[PDB]
Amino acid sequence: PFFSSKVKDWVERLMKTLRDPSLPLLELQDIMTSVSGRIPPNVEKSIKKEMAQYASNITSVLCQFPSQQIANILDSHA
Amino acid sequence: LAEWLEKQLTEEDGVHSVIEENIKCISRDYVLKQIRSLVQANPEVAMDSIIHMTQHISPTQRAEVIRI
Incomplete structure (x- = not known):
């Protein structure tokens, strides 16, 4: 029975x-x-920077994931 | 007329930055129109646009928005 709670x-x-x-x-x-x-390392310094300042910039009023940014970097060296 | 035109741009920090102020007003107006057109095409953006816009603005302005 616990499901309806769980x-x-x-x-x-x-x-x-x-x-x-x-x-x-x-x-x-x-x-x-x-x-x-x-x-x-181009892609590592990119990812590791920007995970780190998603972390720094979290709890901002205007914080969105930098999707287009990571994708674009990948896009150019692809 | 050439001489006149140069001084407005050329004479720094005078009473000649008239055109400069006017253009700033023009930029603001056109930009405002961009916002209006943009929201019309994309009305969903309004709410979120403000939050970003509001992160710094005067406290007095905060009062005026809530009263109005």
Whole structure:
């Protein structure tokens, strides 16, 4: 029976941690740390800078992910 | 007339930066029109546009926006 309770808690942890704009940071930290090698430093200094100042600029009123920026860098050296 | 035209641009920090002020007004107006047209094409942008715009502005201005 516990499901009708269990999912309610579960759903708040999801939605809540999904509004929390520290998600892209926590997943881009963790992924870009775990594929740290095999790495071209132009793209590494780009990713590691900008994860770091997504981290610094989180909690800003005007903070959006720099999607187009990372993609564009990848786009030019691709 | 040539002589006149040069001094407005050329004479720095005088009473000649008339045209400069006028143009600043012009830039502001055209920019404003850009915002109007842009929001018409993209009305969804309004709310978020303000938050970015508001991150610094005067406290008095904050009062005027809420009253109005």
